[PDB]
Each structure stands twice: as C-alpha cells, then as structure tokens.
Ligand binder design. Structure first.
Ligand SMILES: [Ca+2]
Ligand SMILES: [Ca+2]
Ligand SMILES: [Ca+2]
Ligand SMILES: [Ca+2]
Ligand SMILES: [Zn+2]
Length: 316
C-alpha cells in the first residue's frame, strides 16, 4: 500500500526484541520500503489460501504472541536481502529487486515452511516438533535461497539436481546465519526444532550422519521417497561444503579449509554461472572447480580444497 515509511518494534518467536520497517496509512503495515521493491508480510489466518491479508497493526508495536512469527519473517527476510546485496551484489532473488512476500500462520499445526515459486510460506508448527518456523534465520534464508536458485540455475526438484537445490539452500541459509552472527553453527533449524529437546536440529552440515543422512556418495539414497531423496542426499553436498570452509579429514581424505567467505563466493558463482536445471553431483563438482579457478587461479589452494572436499565425499 501507499504510505509513510516508519519503524516499529516487536518481539520475535524466541522472545527477542527487534525493530522492523513498517508503513503507515491509517494502520501500520508490515511493509518494508527500504529494500528493493519492498518486503511484505501477510497473515494467512490459519487458512491455506495465499497470500492472505497484508499484516496490519493499530499501534506499530508487535508484542502479542500472534505477532511473533510475522515479526521474524519480516525481519529475517530483510537480513537475507541485505546478505545477498552486500555480499554478492545481488538485488533480491531475481537480481532486479523483486518484492519479497511472506505469509505466516499458514494452516494449523503445520510443521514446515516453503518457497512456492511466488512467495515464502511459514507454518506455526505443532508446538512439539516445531515452533513457528520463521523464528529460525537459517530456515528463512534457506527458503529465500530457493527463490534465487529458481531464477538462476533452475535446478529441478528431483533426484540429484534436487539434492543440489536443497544443499544450496542449506549452505546459504547457514552463511546468512553467520552473517547475522546469531549464535551461528553448521546445523539447520536448531532454533525452531523440538523446543523440548536441546542440542538437536533438523539436519547437520558438519556431520549429516548424526541424523541418518549420507555423508558420502556411496551411501546415497536411490529410492523414490522425498522426490528421490532431495532432503537426504543433500547431506553429501552439505558435508563437502562444510569441509571446504572448515577443513578436516573425512574417510581418510584431508581437506584444508578456506573459510566461509570463499565458500560463499565459489558456490554463488557456480550457482549463477555454471549450473543448469539438470546438473548432477559430478557436474556440481566441475562447476565448483571452475568457479574457484575463475576466482583464485588453477594452481590455487582454493581449487585444491574444492577438489579434496568432493573427493572426500566420493563425488568424481
Ligand atoms: Ca500492536
Ligand atoms: Ca544457530
Ligand atoms: Ca543453524
Ligand atoms: Ca530442539
Ligand atoms: Zn528446501
């Protein structure tokens, strides 16, 4: 809507206070005009109809429990936009400042969040398995990254290409978590997963096997469930990414870590310049090696580490 840009205050899912950009026109709306064509957050009111109604508030204060998921979805979409703009010089997910829209309170007891090709959608969780999913910055960044992938490589959500699609979202979801310096780690969804159990997460990039996910190509899932194991086989790529950044010895293969910043630069270039809709693991390796070569030279330590990491997870 058309109005005056202002700043409100609220509390997120985890009870932390934060300032959020809003727009005033009779009501205060969750519309951030400071980033690209804007960030808009909607209330799905427990229904499955999208996007719902643009979030309206009477006093620009968002401290009600019902407001929490909206506060975080709005705020973290902003942080993710900042990450892509400041670190990769990319304006929004399409590279042309496309408006970012999110709907919260989707359905009832919905234990998931997703990018549907047009916008982000967040369930509130059932309170046991998950609490409102927008409370996890890595989750928000994971989903928005699917938008970036859709507009670039266009990886099909099936089999190996789908696993790469998922891994890319986990990788950048984690890099954004580090960017915001919000208790960063290499785990996925730890802030909103199982509130009654501490120390766990949905997936682990440092050790995928901790939750039963493969950490080597020889252990890849070849079934048909989960669209060919897109959330399962992603562990193979996630482990490779973790090794490239942090280093370590995996299955007898040693990798010298090159850091998170270079990891991000290498994968962003691979994603935007070399990957295609049907790229498989072997092609991702080639794309990553070529990207590191473009950026640091064929005889660089960076290229060596990328090769070692993929060798460690068995991807030739
Ligand atoms: Ca209010
Ligand atoms: Ca964390
Ligand atoms: Ca995390
Ligand atoms: Ca937990
Ligand atoms: Zn995903």
């Amino acid at each position: 809507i058309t109005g005056t840009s202002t700043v409100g205050v609220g509390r997120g899912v985890l009870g932390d206070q934060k300032n959020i950009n809003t727009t005033y026109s009779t009501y205060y709306y969750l519309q951030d005009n400071t980033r690209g064509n804007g960030i808009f957050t909607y209330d799905a009111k427990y229904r499955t109809t999208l996007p719902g109604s643009l979030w309206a508030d009477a006093d620009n204060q968002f401290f009600a429990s019902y407001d929490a998921p909206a506060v975080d979805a709005h705020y973290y979409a902003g942080v993710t936009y900042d990450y892509y703009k400041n670190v990769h010089n990319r304006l929004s997910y399409d590279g042309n400042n496309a408006a970012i829209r999110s709907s919260v309170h989707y359905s009832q007891g919905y234990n998931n969040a997703f990018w549907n090709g047009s916008q982000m959608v967040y369930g509130d969780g059932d309170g046991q398995t998950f609490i409102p999913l927008s409370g996890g910055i890595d989750v928000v960044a994971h989903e928005l990254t699917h938008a970036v992938t859709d507009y670039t490589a266009g990886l099909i959500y099936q089999n190996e290409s789908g696993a790469i699609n998922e891994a890319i979202s986990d990788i950048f979801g984690t890099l954004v978590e580090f960017y915001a310096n919000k208790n960063p780690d290499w785990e996925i969804g730890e802030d909103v997963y199982t509130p009654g159990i501490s120390g766990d997460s949905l997936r682990s990039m440092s050790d995928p096997a901790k939750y039963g996910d493969p950490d080597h190509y020889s252990k890849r899932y070849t079934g048909t469930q989960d669209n060919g194991g897109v959330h399962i086989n992603s562990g193979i790529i996630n482990k490779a990414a973790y090794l490239i950044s942090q280093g370590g010895t995996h299955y007898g293969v040693s990798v010298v870590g090159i850091g998170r910043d270079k990891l991000g630069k290498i994968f962003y270039r691979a994603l935007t310049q070399y990957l295609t809709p049907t790229s498989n693991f072997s092609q991702l390796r080639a794309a990553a090696v070529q990207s590191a070569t473009d950026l640091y030279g064929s005889t660089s330590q960076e290229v060596a580490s990328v090769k070692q990491a993929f060798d460690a997870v068995g991807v030739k």
